[PDB]
Amino acid sequence: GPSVFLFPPKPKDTLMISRTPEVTCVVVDVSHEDPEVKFNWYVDGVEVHNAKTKPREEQYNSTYRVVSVLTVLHQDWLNGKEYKCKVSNKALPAPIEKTISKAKGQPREPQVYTLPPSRDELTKNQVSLTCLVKGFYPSDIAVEWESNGQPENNYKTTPPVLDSDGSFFLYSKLTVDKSRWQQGNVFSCSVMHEALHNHYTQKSLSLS
Amino acid sequence: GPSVFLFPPKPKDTLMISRTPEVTCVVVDVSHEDPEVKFNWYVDGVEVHNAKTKPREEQYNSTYRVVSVLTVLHQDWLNGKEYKCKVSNKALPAPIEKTISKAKGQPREPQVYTLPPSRDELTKNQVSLTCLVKGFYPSDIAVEWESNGQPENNYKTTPPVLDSDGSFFLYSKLTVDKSRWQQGNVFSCSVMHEALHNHYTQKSLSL
Ligand SMILES: *[C@@H]1O[C@H](CO[C@@H]2O[C@@H](C)[C@@H](O)[C@@H](O)[C@@H]2O)[C@@H](O[C@@H]2O[C@H](CO)[C@@H](O[C@@H]3O[C@H](CO[C@H]4O[C@H](CO)[C@@H](O)[C@H](O)[C@@H]4O[C@@H]4O[C@H](CO)[C@@H](O[C@@H]5O[C@H](CO)[C@H](O)[C@H](O)[C@H]5O)[C@H](O)[C@H]4NC(C)=O)[C@@H](O)[C@H](O[C@H]4O[C@H](CO)[C@@H](O)[C@H](O)[C@@H]4O)[C@@H]3O)[C@H](O)[C@H]2NC(C)=O)[C@H](O)[C@H]1NC(C)=O
Ligand SMILES: *[C@@H]1O[C@H](CO)[C@@H](O[C@@H]2O[C@H](CO)[C@@H](O[C@@H]3O[C@H](CO[C@H]4O[C@H](CO)[C@@H](O)[C@H](O)[C@@H]4O[C@@H]4O[C@H](CO)[C@@H](O)[C@H](O)[C@H]4NC(C)=O)[C@@H](O)[C@H](O[C@H]4O[C@H](CO)[C@@H](O)[C@H](O)[C@@H]4O)[C@@H]3O)[C@H](O)[C@H]2NC(C)=O)[C@H](O)[C@H]1NC(C)=O
């Protein structure tokens, strides 16, 4: 029969009060013969009725895909409430239930260090600016780069890696033209995480 | 019926002449009623005969596990030859064949940079020494830290990450007591990869 996948809000959405975090319930392999789908939503067991469901969408493998979106409160998600999606369909003997909640664990504050290019890399046309983010827990986190108040997006960030003390670390690498570095332009690594004060910190990096 | 899993050599094994790279053919769920297992091995379609096979070993679920190991030549593996394991068993309508080979794609040479701790971290009891390895392809690679003729224990390396130009990068983080760093000890990041000259390079870092 059909299948359900339940997805969390984005970390940045839960950590910045101005943004709009959502939980999303996706149902796939919904047949043409029985396309009717009912969603029930629960927060710590209590039904809520503010979910928005989008219309059937025919796939290329001749099935329907149907999506329901629940807006969540920032502080409910961060406080560990459980979000349950129940999907009912004529083709299901019993409805499918999926539950999701924030990654558990005692929070630990990321330490954020910026590292300039190696001298050896200055022979290249482009150089690497590095942000080390370590000692954090749980692993949900957002790391971004900017300069003069504007996003610098030519970067890649590693997945979180479990360290030997049970916390996580990652590195983000921003590539910039060497000339911008050598001209003394200032770059900053921004980190958003539940265990930071105001859920945000920034560290700068430039050539002296 | 029985099942076959074919495993490659470890990348480091293929890169250093001192080591012995092997391909391993394991067959599981071999029955008591039909316990006989025959291996045939091929390299680019040509049968080879120097594989070493171990005797059946009964498992706690009352089936046998039987392993055949083929030693490979380092340069054959790196040159992309294909290794085929054919497994024959009376309980099989037809023999099972599995094939394995090195990852494809144009190789690219890693660039290796060591980075000292940030000034802000020097207030801590332990500090982080960083090895950036970038611009490499394929993603198979070994990264190790040493100091004073001995490997270091407290390091972790990220998985390879696909960069915007289609090569990979990673970072390796070595944690040492601040005192060792301040005393001027030299640390070294060694990298082994098929696209390096002699498949090896090293970069050092000290205060
Ligand atoms: C017929 O076709 C359909 C769909 O059409 C195909 O789908 C695409 C992907 C291509 O493959 C093409 O072939 C077609 O277009 C098939 O539907 C697929 O079924 C799969 C199951 O058989 C299912 O696999 C599971 O994937 C999970 C991951 O899903 C992610 O990621 C995939 C790939 O990265 C992506 O395609 C999905 O869209 C989904 O992506 C996320 O979607 C959410 C929802 O919007 C995005 O939303 C953001 O998230 C939050 C929400 O609150 C936030 O608030 C934001 O507001 C919001 O924007 C989110 O951004 C997306 N993330 C990413 C990274 O993209 C896996 O987790 C899962 O594995 C786990 O479970 C398995 C089962 O137990 C385990 O084996 C496993 O170990 C794991 O535990 C599955 O592998 C596909 O997702 C699903 N595809 C779609 C589009 O729904 C259908 O199967 C097929 N039928 C037949 C018979 O062929
Ligand atoms: C009776 O008991 C038997 C022994 O206990 C059971 O045997 C087990 O059978 C299953 C399949 O039914 C096999 O599962 C496969 O494992 C592959 C990986 O195996 C490696 O890693 C596991 C986990 O650590 C380890 O136990 C294995 O021994 C093996 O280790 C590797 O061995 C090689 C060769 O010596 C060595 O070079 C490696 O270094 C070493 N690695 C490590 C980490 O130690 C999986 O990759 C297989 O995946 C298949 O299925 C996937 C499904 O998504 C698919 O994506 C893949 O592409 C692939 O098709 C597969 O899951 C077990 O390995 C096997 N155990 C042993 C010891 O052989 C037997 O099942 C049981 N029978 C019954 C009826 O109960």
The verdict on A110 and A203 lying in the same domain is yes
Q: Which amino acid is at B16?
A: M
The verdict on B69 and B125 lying in the same domain is no
| Spatial separation of the C-alpha atoms in residues A32 and A55, rounded to whole Å | 14
| Spatial separation of the C-alpha atoms in residues B145 and B187, rounded to whole Å | 7
DSSP A108: B
The residue from B68, B101, B134 where one domain ends is: B101
Structure tokens at B182: 């301040």
The verdict on A106 and A86 lying in the same domain is no
| Spatial separation of the C-alpha atoms in residues A173 and A182, rounded to whole Å | 18
Interchain CB contact of A165 with B (< 8 Å): no
Quote helix, strand, coil % in chain A, to nearest 5: 10, 50, 40
Specify whether the backbone of A80 is left (phi greater than 0), alpha (psi in -120 to 50) or beta.
Answer: left
Residue found under tokens 């921004």 = A190
Residue found under tokens 């794609």 = B105
Pairing of strands A22-30, A3-7: antiparallel
The verdict on B113 and B202 lying in the same domain is yes
The verdict on B138 and B85 lying in the same domain is no
| Nearest CA among A143, A9, A142 for reference residue A74 | A9
| Nearest CA among B16, B33, B77, B27 for reference residue B56 | B27
Pairing of strands B38-43, B83-88: antiparallel
Query: What sections of A16-143 are H helices per DSSP?
Result: 74-78
| Nearest CA among A98, A99, A48, A38 for reference residue A72 | A48
| Spatial separation of the C-alpha atoms in residues B162 and B160, rounded to whole Å | 7
- With CA atoms as reference, the chain B residue closest to A135 would be B128
Ligand 2, atom 48: nearest CA belongs to which residue? B5
Structure tokens at A112: 């954020």
The verdict on A39 and A107 lying in the same domain is no
Q: B156 vs A164: CB contact, 8 Å cut-off?
A: yes
Residues A171/A157, Cβ–Cβ less than 8 Å: yes
The verdict on A160 and A171 lying in the same domain is yes
**CATH number reported for the structural domain that contains residue A18 in this entry:** 2.60.40.10
Tally of domains in chain A: 2
Pairing of strands A52-53, A64-71: antiparallel
- Three-state SS for A161? strand
| Nearest CA among B84, B107, B88, B124 for reference residue B1 | B88
Residue found under tokens 């970390």 = A11
Q: A161 vs B163: CB contact, 8 Å cut-off?
A: no
Pairing of strands B3-7, A187-192: unpaired
The verdict on A90 and A173 lying in the same domain is no
| Spatial separation of the C-alpha atoms in residues B196 and A42, rounded to whole Å | 56
| Spatial separation of the C-alpha atoms in residues B197 and B109, rounded to whole Å | 9
Chain B: nearest CA to A200, how far in angstroms? Answer: 18
Residues B146/B131, Cβ–Cβ less than 8 Å: no
Cβ partners under 8 Å of residue B30, min gap 6: B2, B37, B56, B63, B64, B65, B66, B89
Check pocket membership of B59 for ligand 2, CB cut-off 6 A: yes
B119 — phi, psi (to 5°)?
-55, -35
C-alpha A144 – ligand 1 centre gap (Å): 25
The residue from A73, A101, A129 where one domain ends is: A101
From the number of C-beta atoms within 10 Å of its C-beta (0-12, 13-18, 19+), residue A43 rates as: middle
| Dihedral sign, Cα of residue B141, residue B146, residue B151, residue B157 | negative
| Spatial separation of the C-alpha atoms in residues A71 and A50, rounded to whole Å | 8
B43 — phi, psi (to 5°)?
-120, 120
Q: Which letter, b or e, does each residue of B96-124 get, where b requires 16 or more Cβ atoms within 10 Å of its Cβ?
A: beeebbbeeeeebebbbbbbbbbeebeee
| Spatial separation of the C-alpha atoms in residues B194 and A199, rounded to whole Å | 43
Structure tokens at B38: 């025959």
The verdict on A20 and A68 lying in the same domain is yes
For the beta carbon of residue A183, count every other beta carbon within 10 angstroms: 10
Residues B85/B39, Cβ–Cβ less than 8 Å: yes
Chain A: nearest CA to B167, how far in angstroms? Answer: 12
Residues A203/A189, Cβ–Cβ less than 8 Å: yes
Q: Which residues of A74-162 form beta strands (DSSP E)?
A: 83-89, 96-100, 111-115, 126-136, 142-147, 150-151, 155-157, 161-162
| Spatial separation of the C-alpha atoms in residues B36 and B92, rounded to whole Å | 11
Residues A4/A84, Cβ–Cβ less than 8 Å: no
Cβ partners under 8 Å of residue B183, min gap 6: none
Cβ partners under 8 Å of residue B168, min gap 6: B134, B136, B137, B138, B139, B141, B160, B161, B162
Q: Which residues of B touch A152 (CB under 8 A)?
A: none
Domain residue limits at A74: 2-101
Q: Pick the atom of ligand 2 nearest to B63's CA.
A: 1
Residues A114/A147, Cβ–Cβ less than 8 Å: no
The residue from A101, A130, A165 where one domain ends is: A101
| Spatial separation of the C-alpha atoms in residues B57 and B79, rounded to whole Å | 34
A–B interface: beta-carbon pairs under 8 A: 71
The verdict on B43 and B119 lying in the same domain is no
The verdict on B8 and B96 lying in the same domain is yes
Structure tokens at A92: 């299901």
CA A132 to chain centre: 18
C-alpha B84 – ligand 1 centre gap (Å): 34
The verdict on A23 and A106 lying in the same domain is no
From the number of C-beta atoms within 10 Å of its C-beta (0-12, 13-18, 19+), residue A57 rates as: exposed
C-alpha B117 – ligand 2 centre gap (Å): 41
Q: What are the DSSP calls for A12-40, one per residue?
A: HHHHSTTS--EEEEEEEEE-SSS--EEEE
Pocket test for ligand 1, best of A3, A4, A7, A15 (most atoms within 8 A of CB): A7
* Alpha-carbon distance values, A163 to A133, B122, B172 (Å): 12, 19, 11
Please give, one letter per residue, the 3-state secondary structure of B122-186: HHCCEEEEEEEEEEEECCCCEEEEEECCEECCCEEECCCEECCCCCEEEEEEEEEEHHHHHCCCC
Picking from A109, A153, A171, A172 by the largest number of B CB atoms within 10 A of its own CB, the best residue to mutate is: A171
